[PDB]
Amino acid sequence: AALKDQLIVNLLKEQVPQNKITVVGVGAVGMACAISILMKDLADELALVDVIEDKLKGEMMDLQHGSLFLKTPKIVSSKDYSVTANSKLVIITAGARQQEGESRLNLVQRNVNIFKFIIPNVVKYSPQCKLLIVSNPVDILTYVAWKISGFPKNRVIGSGCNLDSARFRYLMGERLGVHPLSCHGWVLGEHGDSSVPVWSGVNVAGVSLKSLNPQLGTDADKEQWKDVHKQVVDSAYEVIKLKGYTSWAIGLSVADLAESIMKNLRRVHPISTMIKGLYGIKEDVFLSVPCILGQNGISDVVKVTLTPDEEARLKKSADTLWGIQKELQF
Amino acid sequence: ALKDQLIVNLLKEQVPQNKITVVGVGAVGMACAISILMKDLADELALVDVIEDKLKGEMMDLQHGSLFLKTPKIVSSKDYSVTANSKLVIITAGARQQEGESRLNLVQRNVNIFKFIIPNVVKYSPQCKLLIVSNPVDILTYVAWKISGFPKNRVIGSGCNLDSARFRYLMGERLGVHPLSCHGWVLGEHGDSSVPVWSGVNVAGVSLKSLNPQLGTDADKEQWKDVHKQVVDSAYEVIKLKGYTSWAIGLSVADLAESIMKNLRRVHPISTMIKGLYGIKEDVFLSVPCILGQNGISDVVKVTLTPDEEARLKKSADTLWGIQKELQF
Amino acid sequence: ALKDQLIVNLLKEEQVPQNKITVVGVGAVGMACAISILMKDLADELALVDVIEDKLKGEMMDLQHGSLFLKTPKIVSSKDYSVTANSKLVIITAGARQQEGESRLNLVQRNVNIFKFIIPNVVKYSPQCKLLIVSNPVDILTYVAWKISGFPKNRVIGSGCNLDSARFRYLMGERLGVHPLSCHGWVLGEHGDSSVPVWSGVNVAGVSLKSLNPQLGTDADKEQWKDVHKQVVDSAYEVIKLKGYTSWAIGLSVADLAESIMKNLRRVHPISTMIKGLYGIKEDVFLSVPCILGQNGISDVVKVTLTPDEEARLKKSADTLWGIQKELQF
Amino acid sequence: AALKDQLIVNLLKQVPQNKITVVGVGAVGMACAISILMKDLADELALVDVIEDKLKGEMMDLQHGSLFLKTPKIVSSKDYSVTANSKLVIITAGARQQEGESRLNLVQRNVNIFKFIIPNVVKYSPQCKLLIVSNPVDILTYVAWKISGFPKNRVIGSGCNLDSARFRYLMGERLGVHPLSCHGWVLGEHGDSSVPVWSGVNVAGVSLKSLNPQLGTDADKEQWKDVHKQVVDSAYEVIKLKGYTSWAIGLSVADLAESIMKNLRRVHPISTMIKGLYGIKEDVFLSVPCILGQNGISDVVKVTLTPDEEARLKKSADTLWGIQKELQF
Ligand SMILES: Cc1nc2ccc(NC(=O)CCNC(N)=O)cc2s1
Ligand SMILES: Cc1nc2ccc(NC(=O)CCNC(N)=O)cc2s1
Ligand SMILES: Cc1nc2ccc(NC(=O)CCNC(N)=O)cc2s1
Ligand SMILES: Cc1nc2ccc(NC(=O)CCNC(N)=O)cc2s1
């Protein structure tokens, strides 16, 4: 004799990947997570899983053809979860996706049923992975993945408000003429309509915007900054109306989370976690609070000093999620 | 105002220094955009299309990921004034080939689209290089060249950069070597008449043809010609499976944009005018290894081809020249 | 010729680089700036300038030998400033450096004299460049470069407290078990002993560390956070005692500033600029305040809300610097 | 309570996954450290040396740069317990060549130092690959392999990775092509007896020797042998000018660290056992093109050398064995 044997002397046979990531779901969200992770050099092996065989194969092939331009030496796919074995991180993006003029909460029951199949299969092949839930409604689906998986809470992470906070910092950046990296502010709670802008922590160079505008984010705000949060809430609905779905910003947000996990950064992110007994909540609700994310998932939660209104809004967000959650079948 | 209480303006201002425009927000256009953004090649990105909603939606979706990027300005419009001061304009607009349809069948539809696009792009960007991605790429690079009236160094077709990348990936798979360490060139038409240059196929300077002179021929026990057949069929296989191709071409285009933006002077198999080489006496555009930098193609590598490889290259040139003779400007 | 047998030339190009960076001084600081800039792909051309011919050629050849692993296609050097022609950014690291125990202010006259030769030469070949001053005392030498160059203030930037602040965030990160990227705090004023930690702006996820500890950074602080600022001030002296100089952290700090300029990022950095008009400063004092940094240099200044003690400390830093800069011989 | 506990609720009661250790904090060691840090290859970086102050100072200077990096833990100690669980251990410690001194002259000093270093590395990092940088690299890779008890694939010498990068840079400068697009292999000893493989020197698959048969001989009108002479002389000239070399070796080591950490299976000219190849009968380690990945060197490419190139390679092996056979450890 063979040309390979005439060219190369083999001295060694077949080891497990060391930094493998799996993306479940090859829809627009899943492929944007896949491309973003590949372009960030986070994995030595990427595995893709879906139920639509041709689509899955074509997407994997399209990725593989770009191998020369990447540093991920193994791109694999299958409808069979055996392909996901030895993953450090498993990203779930599968299910019904948010529709034009409809809440993400409208996808709940269908995605719970789909997770009843996915989660045990993922768990069977990578019992020590970190689960990263992207599918909507993300906060409810994270709690669901947590209950089905049997994993300790640190290993079940929801993409949550990482994107809402990025959109908020972009918008704040545009108003101020400052790069989003230099605009600080957190959007917590539900990754959806009941999200909470923490105006009290919004700052540039440590300068509290609330200190220069006491009314910041209220109805009395002469600059109507609440409209920036309105823009955050509405963003997915506007993007879906224009292009039919959202993909790029979420793919970049998920890769940002994957980077913190894969490289054990211990950076703080506003991501879905169990808040039972934290803030003002007594229900087994998952929602975004600032978390320290690293190699073991969520190891710590930052306790944000919320104003009485911010606390009320966060309790309201938890209630809206518990309200939907309590009535589900699983 | 809150901005004035927080920030003192000290300076009243300037032209983008490393601007890139992507024409077409279809799957190819959007994969080029995400790839370019994730490689930090531009200080400004402009998007152009004819479908207003889709264009705004794509622009907004990219803008929302700005925190995770290093491209501080992302803009879009149907109006080409948005593309002003681009150093590189990437054209991905036009009809795409169906299963069983040759890229050469897209000619009349895409030339008519280029008749509008090309004069509008060149208008606002004196310093731009035109990078053609739309198909048939070789023919459309000649069309972009004729319409723009640009010098040949400035008009580039993505050509066989992806064909050679695919060939390199497939060779790597057979050998258990990364594509980076698998060398091989696929030249000519980015289509059915492409030419695998078996004479230059190597690992660590070792010629695979020197080890097997039957390499790439029907006599080949390992049927290495099937690797070139797979390169030829690749777009069609992917189209049949997922409906279109996007990721690999996006990465191939960002690779070329990187060499241009960073004046790397790397060698790529890309569409250029070959009048004067291999006995070609006409204004044919096709892929040959080109040195690519800040002024586009400044130099062309003269690949030494065996008589059969040269014959296959002239056959690809005749095929492309025949289609050029059908062009109605 | 072999080159011509292998290659057909199409045109004689205008070889003028688009993103050229010059590093003046090939000492330990200059070379650390050089390697960090090459490893960040910020430049299409890197030029080195020094007065020691052998060391200059040696440093240039060594960086050139690594070209295969880089994306900076031209690395050049000369004692002649003609080699610096058409630079977008010129980083000055040349001059005397602190000996063990030596104040950065002690380098003032020697460095002002060196700058009298350097600055006109830089200006001669790159009249549109942004000047980035790293040589010490940085604040005073930024004033010197400004006066000599005749450039508008936006294009004359001092590395200032970019590193002091990075050290502060690192130390804060170590105390809290959080990545420095998620620890926020600003060290302002002189890049030296009179620097000011802004305790009011020190936070993790927008939670003011002082709101949890009212006595944060004071003598009454049970946890003695003031020692974090003392460690910041002492850092270079401690590193100098141990390794004889500092290099890596300043190199990374300078490339961070180079990145904001070259890529027009408009990020906020605590760097040396004229503060005439802020905190009751009526003179041409250059010192670190948070600045928006982009392609045109310092376009804007963030007005930080200082406590009366913080403002008094900043005005003391301002007076220490003005005492020296007002009497300079040039 | 404490401020930390007022700010943070701990919910989880710490072993690195991609740790790298650099042994020796001289100019080579620190160039390796910064290059690795800037390539984001490790989640933990450990430094080891015998000079306490110097080690502490270097560690501290790296830590102070943590904000600009993605390596969340930088540690150091004289004690090898600090290197626990490394996936890669880079050895740069030992005597370095003076002006006018061969790397081969450092052998006794460096073999004696390796007797202490190698068993302490292996004791705390049983899963690691050993990357030898200290000189003479080829002999020290053999020595580290023998001492360690590690299989030969896990004991790699930086070898000719830098010699080949130097050759590719010089070739690029002569041709006006980026080194990435200039292919050429310098094999054998990382020293005076290195072998430029002229037969494999090519641009885009075009052999330079096919265009110029005299390539690399004294008859060559363009004197391309001066390129290999500059490669051989490079460390001596740089040492004569600046007192040592650091930047190019640092980047060459980070290149090898990348292929290892990311299991790339790229081809590099690095130190491995050549017994059984080109009729070499002894346990000589020298550079040949190797496939490098997560398990180190898994495969060796068999370069087809001309009679003179093969004679030069066997002469390099003979030189190395001349020094190696007289070693006591
Ligand atoms: C039992 C099941 N397992 C899977 C696995 C993947 C997918 N794939 C998608 O749903 C992709 C499209 N969806 C979005 N939102 O992008 C569906 C199912 S159903
Ligand atoms: C006169 C015209 N100007 C344009 C500009 C953009 C587009 N856009 C596309 O064709 C995108 C979809 N096509 C592919 N190949 O992705 C069409 C036209 S028609
Ligand atoms: C008139 C003069 N022009 C120059 C230019 C460069 C240098 N080079 C250094 O000072 C390097 C060493 N110094 C530090 N601080 O690294 C000195 C002079 S004197
Ligand atoms: C028993 C011993 N263990 C060590 C460990 C480190 C070092 N450090 C250096 O040798 C660094 C300087 N040398 C070069 N070549 O850079 C020496 C020794 S001696």
Side-chain angles (χ1 to χ4, degrees), chain A residues 1-13 16-52 54-73 75-78 80-87 89-115 117-146 148-221 223-229 231-240 242-275 277-281 284-314 317-328 330, chain B residues 1-11 15-77 79-145 147-213 215-220 222-239 241-280 282-314 316-329, chain C residues 1-14 16-52 54-73 75-78 80-98 100-115 117-123 125-146 148-214 216-221 223-225 227-229 231-240 242-275 277-280 282-314 317-328 330, chain D residues 1-12 15-51 53-77 79-145 147-220 222-228 230-239 241-274 276-280 282-314 316-324 326-327 329:
Chain A
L3 178 64
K4 190 200 183 169
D5 296 319
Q6 281 192 267
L7 179 66
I8 299 159
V9 186
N10 171 261
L11 314 166
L12 207 74
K13 199 177 176 183
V16 143
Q18 293 295 105
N19 292 283
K20 168 187 194 162
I21 296 174
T22 290
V23 176
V24 180
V26 302
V29 176
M31 288 325 284
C33 292
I35 200 71
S36 296
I37 284 150
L38 285 161
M39 298 201 76
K40 282 182 84 71
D41 296 334
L42 302 172
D44 57 345
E45 179 168 328
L46 169 69
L48 307 177
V49 172
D50 209 287
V51 292
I52 307 302
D54 283 358
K55 171 64 168 173
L56 181 60
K57 192 192 180 177
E59 290 297 359
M60 168 199 74
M61 274 183 62
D62 207 4
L63 289 182
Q64 280 167 341
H65 298 168
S67 284
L68 174 68
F69 319 108
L70 299 169
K71 301 279 189 61
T72 307
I75 299 163
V76 292
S77 78
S78 190
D80 189 331
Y81 287 80
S82 59
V83 81
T84 75
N86 311 115
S87 296
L89 179 60
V90 183
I91 310 167
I92 318 291
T93 73
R97 74 175 175 191
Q98 193 188 4
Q99 297 292 293
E100 190 177 355
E102 282 184 65
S103 169
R104 291 169 184 87
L105 299 183
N106 304 8
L107 315 158
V108 82
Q109 196 55 61
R110 286 167 287 176
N111 291 348
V112 161
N113 300 341
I114 279 158
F115 269 43
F117 177 87
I118 302 177
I119 312 297
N121 283 314
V122 165
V123 165
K124 179 182 170 179
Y125 294 100
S126 300
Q128 294 175 289
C129 74
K130 271 71 71 180
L131 275 167
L132 179 53
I133 311 305
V134 188
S135 306
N136 280 313
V138 72
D139 308 296
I140 292 153
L141 292 182
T142 305
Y143 164 84
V144 167
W146 173 61
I148 298 165
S149 68
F151 277 9
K153 66 174 150 57
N154 54 295
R155 296 205 275 114
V156 192
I157 309 112
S159 53
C161 287
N162 199 56
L163 180 48
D164 309 64
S165 297
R167 291 175 161 141
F168 183 91
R169 304 170 65 179
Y170 158 73
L171 294 173
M172 185 194 162
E174 274 296 320
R175 273 198 184 203
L176 303 172
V178 182
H179 197 280
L181 284 164
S182 292
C183 296
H184 310 283
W186 304 70
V187 171
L188 305 177
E190 187 209 356
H191 167 62
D193 310 352
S194 66
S195 77
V196 181
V198 182
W199 299 111
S200 61
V202 168
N203 76 83
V204 167
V207 188
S208 169
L209 266 62
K210 202 193 170 194
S211 69
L212 316 156
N213 180 9
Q215 296 163 325
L216 191 81
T218 75
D219 290 346
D221 179 4
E223 291 229 320
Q224 297 288 305
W225 279 77
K226 192 178 225 287
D227 295 333
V228 174
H229 176 250
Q231 276 178 278
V232 172
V233 166
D234 294 352
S235 64
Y237 299 89
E238 174 70 319
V239 174
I240 294 164
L242 302 161
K243 66 168 264 190
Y245 57 86
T246 105
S247 51
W248 312 119
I250 189 70
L252 284 168
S253 173
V254 171
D256 178 46
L257 295 176
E259 188 189 0
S260 278
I261 291 156
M262 301 299 287
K263 302 188 80 49
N264 186 34
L265 299 177
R266 299 179 60 80
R267 276 192 297 186
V268 184
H269 301 266
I271 50 177
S272 328
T273 201
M274 186 191 82
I275 37 92
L278 303 164
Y279 290 74
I281 300 106
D284 233 6
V285 175
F286 275 56
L287 55 76
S288 294
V289 290
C291 301
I292 296 175
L293 189 64
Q295 74 186 3
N296 301 319
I298 300 158
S299 59
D300 311 83
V301 155
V302 182
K303 291 179 270 179
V304 180
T305 52
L306 297 177
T307 67
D309 162 34
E310 287 163 357
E311 190 175 311
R313 290 186 180 270
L314 189 77
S317 186
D319 285 340
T320 301
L321 292 161
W322 176 249
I324 294 293
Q325 199 170 288
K326 68 181 279 188
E327 299 306 338
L328 303 171
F330 95 97
Chain B
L2 174 66
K3 186 185 169 179
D4 295 331
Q5 286 179 249
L6 179 73
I7 304 156
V8 194
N9 177 244
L10 299 183
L11 196 70
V15 168
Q17 297 294 301
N18 294 278
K19 185 167 177 178
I20 300 177
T21 290
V22 174
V23 178
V25 296
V28 171
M30 291 313 298
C32 292
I34 197 63
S35 298
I36 286 156
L37 289 167
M38 297 196 78
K39 285 172 81 60
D40 310 307
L41 302 173
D43 61 355
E44 183 179 329
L45 175 72
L47 300 182
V48 182
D49 208 286
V50 297
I51 316 303
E52 287 189 52
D53 277 5
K54 170 68 166 174
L55 176 70
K56 185 188 188 177
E58 287 303 347
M59 175 200 72
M60 281 178 64
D61 202 3
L62 293 183
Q63 284 168 339
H64 296 167
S66 291
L67 181 63
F68 316 116
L69 295 175
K70 297 279 179 65
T71 303
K73 190 176 187 175
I74 302 164
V75 288
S76 74
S77 179
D79 189 326
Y80 285 87
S81 63
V82 80
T83 72
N85 303 294
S86 290
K87 293 300 188 67
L88 181 63
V89 178
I90 308 181
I91 314 294
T92 76
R96 307 167 299 261
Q97 69 280 12
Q98 293 174 322
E99 289 179 58
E101 190 187 23
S102 177
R103 288 175 186 87
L104 298 182
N105 206 50
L106 309 169
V107 77
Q108 299 293 120
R109 286 169 280 166
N110 293 350
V111 169
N112 286 338
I113 282 169
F114 270 48
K115 274 175 186 182
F116 179 78
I117 303 184
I118 307 296
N120 283 298
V121 295
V122 306
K123 203 181 176 180
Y124 298 105
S125 299
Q127 292 185 251
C128 82
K129 268 62 63 188
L130 292 175
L131 176 54
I132 309 308
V133 185
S134 310
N135 281 305
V137 73
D138 307 293
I139 305 287
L140 296 181
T141 305
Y142 169 80
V143 164
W145 175 67
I147 299 173
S148 64
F150 269 27
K152 67 178 182 190
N153 62 285
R154 297 240 217 152
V155 194
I156 308 124
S158 52
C160 286
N161 200 61
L162 168 58
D163 307 71
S164 297
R166 283 164 169 153
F167 185 87
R168 287 172 78 186
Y169 158 73
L170 297 159
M171 166 179 178
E173 282 300 304
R174 286 197 176 203
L175 306 167
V177 180
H178 199 280
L180 284 161
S181 303
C182 289
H183 310 281
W185 304 75
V186 166
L187 303 182
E189 183 200 2
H190 163 65
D192 307 341
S193 69
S194 68
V195 188
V197 184
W198 302 112
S199 60
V201 171
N202 76 91
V203 174
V206 182
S207 167
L208 267 62
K209 200 186 160 69
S210 77
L211 304 175
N212 180 21
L215 180 83
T217 79
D218 305 310
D220 188 1
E222 282 173 47
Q223 291 292 304
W224 279 79
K225 201 183 192 163
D226 291 352
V227 176
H228 179 237
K229 180 178 170 63
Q230 277 179 271
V231 169
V232 169
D233 300 342
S234 62
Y236 294 94
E237 300 288 355
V238 173
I239 287 158
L241 299 156
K242 60 167 270 181
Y244 57 88
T245 94
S246 63
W247 310 114
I249 188 61
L251 288 163
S252 168
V253 172
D255 176 55
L256 302 174
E258 181 186 10
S259 290
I260 302 168
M261 298 311 284
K262 307 186 72 53
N263 192 30
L264 294 180
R265 298 184 60 81
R266 290 189 301 198
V267 178
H268 299 274
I270 48 175
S271 339
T272 201
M273 204 196 59
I274 55 124
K275 190 168 88 199
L277 321 154
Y278 318 100
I280 294 107
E282 307 295 347
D283 287 349
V284 177
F285 271 75
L286 59 64
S287 290
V288 285
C290 294
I291 298 171
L292 187 63
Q294 76 179 341
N295 291 301
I297 301 168
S298 57
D299 303 276
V300 168
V301 175
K302 300 182 261 179
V303 181
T304 54
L305 304 166
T306 69
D308 181 66
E309 286 164 0
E310 193 172 311
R312 287 166 169 264
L313 191 69
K314 285 184 233 186
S316 180
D318 295 334
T319 297
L320 290 164
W321 182 243
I323 302 302
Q324 286 178 238
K325 292 200 264 185
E326 295 294 335
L327 299 171
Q328 294 302 140
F329 297 95
Chain C
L2 180 65
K3 193 226 205 147
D4 306 316
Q5 268 180 272
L6 180 82
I7 295 153
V8 189
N9 175 250
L10 305 202
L11 86 162
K12 279 72 151 64
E13 296 164 75
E14 182 234 30
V16 175
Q18 293 302 288
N19 287 291
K20 183 184 182 167
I21 300 179
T22 291
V23 176
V24 177
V26 299
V29 174
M31 291 318 290
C33 290
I35 198 71
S36 304
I37 281 158
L38 288 166
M39 299 200 74
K40 288 178 78 54
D41 311 310
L42 304 178
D44 55 347
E45 186 177 316
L46 174 65
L48 307 172
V49 181
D50 209 285
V51 292
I52 317 301
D54 279 7
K55 166 79 163 163
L56 178 64
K57 186 183 180 183
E59 287 305 349
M60 170 195 79
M61 284 182 59
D62 203 6
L63 295 181
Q64 282 168 343
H65 292 173
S67 299
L68 173 62
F69 317 111
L70 302 165
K71 299 281 173 70
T72 311
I75 297 156
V76 291
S77 80
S78 187
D80 200 308
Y81 285 79
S82 65
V83 83
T84 81
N86 317 300
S87 296
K88 287 303 178 78
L89 181 57
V90 181
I91 308 159
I92 315 292
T93 73
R97 59 140 156 101
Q98 324 168 247
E100 179 176 342
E102 185 182 20
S103 170
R104 288 169 189 90
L105 298 167
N106 205 41
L107 318 170
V108 84
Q109 203 51 66
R110 288 176 277 171
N111 295 352
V112 163
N113 285 343
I114 285 160
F115 268 51
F117 175 83
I118 301 177
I119 310 297
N121 276 305
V122 166
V123 179
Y125 297 100
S126 312
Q128 298 311 125
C129 81
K130 275 75 61 180
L131 272 177
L132 177 61
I133 313 305
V134 195
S135 309
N136 278 310
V138 74
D139 305 297
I140 300 170
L141 298 178
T142 307
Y143 169 75
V144 171
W146 175 65
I148 303 172
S149 68
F151 281 5
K153 73 195 175 179
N154 58 291
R155 289 200 283 121
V156 195
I157 307 113
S159 59
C161 290
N162 204 58
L163 180 53
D164 303 76
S165 288
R167 283 167 167 152
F168 189 86
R169 297 171 68 180
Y170 158 76
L171 297 163
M172 175 180 171
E174 284 311 314
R175 283 196 176 204
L176 304 173
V178 175
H179 198 274
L181 283 169
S182 298
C183 295
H184 308 282
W186 301 71
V187 171
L188 304 177
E190 169 196 22
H191 166 60
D193 311 344
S194 72
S195 70
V196 183
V198 185
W199 297 106
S200 67
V202 172
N203 76 96
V204 168
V207 182
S208 162
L209 260 63
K210 196 200 165 179
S211 72
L212 297 178
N213 182 14
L216 183 84
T218 70
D219 287 326
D221 189 343
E223 265 170 60
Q224 295 281 289
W225 286 76
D227 298 333
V228 177
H229 180 244
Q231 269 181 286
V232 163
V233 165
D234 300 346
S235 59
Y237 300 93
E238 173 71 326
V239 179
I240 291 155
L242 297 160
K243 58 170 276 189
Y245 60 89
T246 89
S247 56
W248 314 118
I250 186 69
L252 286 160
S253 176
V254 167
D256 178 52
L257 299 180
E259 192 191 1
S260 300
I261 294 157
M262 302 300 285
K263 307 184 76 52
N264 190 35
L265 297 175
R266 296 185 62 87
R267 287 189 297 199
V268 179
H269 299 273
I271 50 172
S272 330
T273 201
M274 183 189 278
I275 56 105
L278 316 165
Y279 317 102
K282 282 163 160 68
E283 304 296 343
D284 294 347
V285 181
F286 275 67
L287 61 70
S288 292
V289 288
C291 298
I292 299 179
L293 193 63
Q295 77 185 19
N296 298 123
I298 297 161
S299 62
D300 304 86
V301 169
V302 182
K303 281 179 275 201
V304 169
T305 51
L306 294 180
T307 71
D309 182 81
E310 282 161 359
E311 202 182 327
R313 281 172 181 268
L314 196 72
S317 193
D319 297 327
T320 298
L321 295 167
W322 183 247
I324 304 173
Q325 64 170 76
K326 80 186 184 79
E327 307 301 349
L328 291 170
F330 72 96
Chain D
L3 178 57
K4 192 190 166 178
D5 303 307
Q6 283 181 270
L7 180 66
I8 305 155
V9 202
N10 172 249
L11 299 164
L12 198 65
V15 64
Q17 299 292 95
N18 291 282
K19 173 180 182 162
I20 298 179
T21 290
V22 178
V23 182
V25 299
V28 176
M30 293 313 302
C32 291
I34 200 63
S35 301
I36 283 160
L37 285 172
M38 294 198 76
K39 280 177 87 70
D40 308 313
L41 300 177
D43 62 340
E44 185 172 326
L45 171 68
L47 302 181
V48 171
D49 211 287
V50 286
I51 313 304
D53 283 17
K54 166 69 165 178
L55 182 65
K56 193 186 177 190
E58 289 297 1
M59 176 201 68
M60 271 182 63
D61 202 1
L62 290 186
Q63 290 169 335
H64 293 173
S66 293
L67 174 65
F68 317 110
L69 301 175
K70 296 284 184 44
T71 307
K73 194 173 191 207
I74 302 165
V75 292
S76 79
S77 191
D79 192 331
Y80 282 84
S81 59
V82 86
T83 77
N85 311 283
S86 297
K87 294 303 168 219
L88 181 62
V89 185
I90 305 171
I91 316 297
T92 72
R96 69 172 325 284
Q97 74 278 32
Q98 280 199 31
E99 209 177 303
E101 184 187 15
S102 183
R103 292 171 184 91
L104 299 170
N105 202 48
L106 309 172
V107 84
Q108 291 73 18
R109 279 169 283 168
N110 294 352
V111 162
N112 294 352
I113 281 150
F114 269 41
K115 288 180 198 168
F116 176 80
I117 298 180
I118 310 297
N120 283 306
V121 166
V122 160
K123 172 183 179 202
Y124 297 100
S125 292
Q127 297 188 287
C128 89
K129 271 76 62 176
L130 282 165
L131 180 56
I132 314 312
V133 193
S134 311
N135 285 308
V137 69
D138 307 298
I139 297 157
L140 300 180
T141 307
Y142 164 81
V143 168
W145 166 63
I147 291 168
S148 60
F150 274 19
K152 72 201 199 294
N153 53 294
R154 288 169 60 189
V155 191
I156 308 107
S158 54
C160 287
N161 203 54
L162 178 54
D163 305 75
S164 289
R166 282 169 164 150
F167 185 96
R168 297 176 67 193
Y169 157 78
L170 295 164
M171 170 178 178
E173 172 178 51
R174 282 191 174 211
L175 297 177
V177 175
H178 198 277
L180 284 163
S181 293
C182 294
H183 309 284
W185 301 76
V186 173
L187 303 182
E189 179 201 9
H190 169 60
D192 302 345
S193 75
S194 66
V195 187
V197 184
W198 300 114
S199 57
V201 171
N202 76 91
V203 169
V206 191
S207 155
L208 273 56
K209 205 178 176 292
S210 277
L211 297 164
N212 178 21
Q214 290 173 328
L215 197 80
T217 78
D218 297 0
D220 186 359
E222 297 191 15
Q223 297 280 281
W224 281 78
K225 193 165 139 185
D226 292 348
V227 175
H228 177 244
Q230 284 171 259
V231 168
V232 171
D233 294 349
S234 62
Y236 305 116
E237 167 73 299
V238 173
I239 287 160
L241 294 161
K242 63 170 267 187
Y244 57 94
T245 92
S246 54
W247 311 119
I249 192 58
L251 290 164
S252 171
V253 167
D255 177 51
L256 297 180
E258 187 179 17
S259 293
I260 300 158
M261 304 297 288
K262 307 188 77 47
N263 188 27
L264 300 179
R265 297 185 58 83
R266 285 191 303 186
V267 176
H268 301 264
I270 50 183
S271 323
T272 203
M273 184 179 269
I274 40 94
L277 303 165
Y278 316 97
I280 288 118
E282 293 304 320
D283 272 21
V284 177
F285 274 61
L286 59 76
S287 290
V288 286
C290 301
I291 304 184
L292 184 65
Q294 74 187 355
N295 298 138
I297 297 169
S298 55
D299 303 86
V300 165
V301 175
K302 286 178 270 181
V303 178
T304 47
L305 305 162
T306 70
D308 194 70
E309 288 160 2
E310 185 157 339
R312 291 172 178 272
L313 191 70
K314 292 190 224 162
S316 192
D318 287 333
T319 297
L320 287 159
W321 175 249
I323 307 298
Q324 199 174 296
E326 302 307 310
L327 279 177
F329 63 96

